[PDB]
Design an enzyme around this catalytic site. Structure first.
Site, PDB file in Angstrom:
ATOM      1  N   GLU A  61      -9.702  48.243   7.790  1.00  0.00           N
ATOM      2  CA  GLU A  61      -8.927  49.185   8.588  1.00  0.00           C
ATOM      3  C   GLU A  61      -9.749  49.723   9.755  1.00  0.00           C
ATOM      4  O   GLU A  61     -10.969  49.889   9.663  1.00  0.00           O
ATOM      5  CB  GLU A  61      -8.444  50.340   7.705  1.00  0.00           C
ATOM      6  CG  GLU A  61      -7.450  51.282   8.374  1.00  0.00           C
ATOM      7  CD  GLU A  61      -6.193  50.574   8.832  1.00  0.00           C
ATOM      8  OE1 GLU A  61      -5.336  50.274   7.972  1.00  0.00           O
ATOM      9  OE2 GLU A  61      -6.073  50.304  10.047  1.00  0.00           O
ATOM     10  N   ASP A  89      -7.066  47.113   3.580  1.00  0.00           N
ATOM     11  CA  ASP A  89      -7.873  48.222   4.077  1.00  0.00           C
ATOM     12  C   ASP A  89      -9.363  48.061   3.811  1.00  0.00           C
ATOM     13  O   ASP A  89     -10.174  48.360   4.694  1.00  0.00           O
ATOM     14  CB  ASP A  89      -7.379  49.541   3.476  1.00  0.00           C
ATOM     15  CG  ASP A  89      -6.031  49.967   4.040  1.00  0.00           C
ATOM     16  OD1 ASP A  89      -5.774  49.677   5.229  1.00  0.00           O
ATOM     17  OD2 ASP A  89      -5.208  50.538   3.284  1.00  0.00           O
ATOM     18  N   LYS A 115       4.388  49.931  -1.956  1.00  0.00           N
ATOM     19  CA  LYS A 115       3.284  49.101  -1.484  1.00  0.00           C
ATOM     20  C   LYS A 115       3.181  47.804  -2.276  1.00  0.00           C
ATOM     21  O   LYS A 115       2.912  46.740  -1.705  1.00  0.00           O
ATOM     22  CB  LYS A 115       1.970  49.882  -1.570  1.00  0.00           C
ATOM     23  CG  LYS A 115       1.632  50.696  -0.327  1.00  0.00           C
ATOM     24  CD  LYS A 115       1.239  49.797   0.844  1.00  0.00           C
ATOM     25  CE  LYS A 115       0.850  50.623   2.059  1.00  0.00           C
ATOM     26  NZ  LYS A 115      -0.026  51.763   1.682  1.00  0.00           N
TER      27      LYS A 115
HETATM   28 MN   LIG Z   1      -3.084  51.389   4.022  1.00  0.00          MN
HETATM   29 MN   LIG Z   2      -3.821  49.193   6.662  1.00  0.00          MN
END
Ligand SMILES: [Mn+2]
Ligand SMILES: [Mn+2]
Length: 176
Positions: A61, A89, A115
């Site tokens: 990220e 991430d 998610k």
């Molecule tokens: Mn995320």
């Molecule tokens: Mn992300």
């Protein structure tokens, strides 16, 4: 706007600049999408604290997509882990798995289901933090130690309370 003021006061300049470039790239102005501004900043900060909680973690990220996919591909060629379809991430070198970090204003299990339905790879580890000190993770394996996760949860609660002191929390929680 007060929300932009709060973002620039409470977040580190590097995180603010990252969030602003991430939004400007797609045509979004942080002076209008102020709650999205705050949410991007908060997610970035959580990722950075997570990665400093170990070096054990590779930060995906925050990187431009070229550099981030370069990192993901290098990891996949040196480790053999399957390539994620969505940019995750972090990467855990100890557990040898990609981690997807989620920060929700809602219930942890709602966002976790969301998610998991999004990524659809049992390989990528999910870790969801709330602003209420609640957390949910794949197989209930929370990767990090109690102290690091307490650090993250305290920071999230503090962001929520500093938003509340400015009468901004109500806008923020109804914005996810
Ligand atoms: Mn995320
Ligand atoms: Mn992300």
């Amino acid at each position: 706007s007060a929300m932009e003021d709060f973002v620039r006061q409470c977040f580190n300049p590097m995180i603010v600049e990252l969030a602003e470039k991430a939004m400007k790239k797609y045509g979004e102005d942080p002076k209008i999408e102020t709650n999205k501004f705050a949410a991007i900043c908060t997610h970035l900060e959580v990722c950075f604290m997570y990665s400093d909680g170990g070096h054990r973690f590779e930060i995906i990220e925050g990187r431009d997509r070229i550099m981030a996919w370069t990192v993901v591909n290098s990891i996949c060629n040196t480790t053999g882990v399957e390539k994620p379809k969505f940019l995750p991430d972090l990467y855990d070198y100890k557990e040898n798995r990609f981690i997807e970090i989620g920060v929700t204003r809602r219930e942890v299990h709602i966002y976790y289901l969301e998610k998991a339905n999004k990524i659809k790879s049992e390989k990528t580890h999910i870790h969801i933090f709330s602003f209420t000190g609640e957390e949910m993770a794949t197989k209930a394996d929370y990767t990090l130690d109690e102290e690091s996760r307490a650090r993250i949860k305290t920071r999230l609660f503090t962001i929520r309370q500093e938003m509340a002191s400015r009468s901004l929390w109500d806008s923020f929680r109804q914005s996810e």
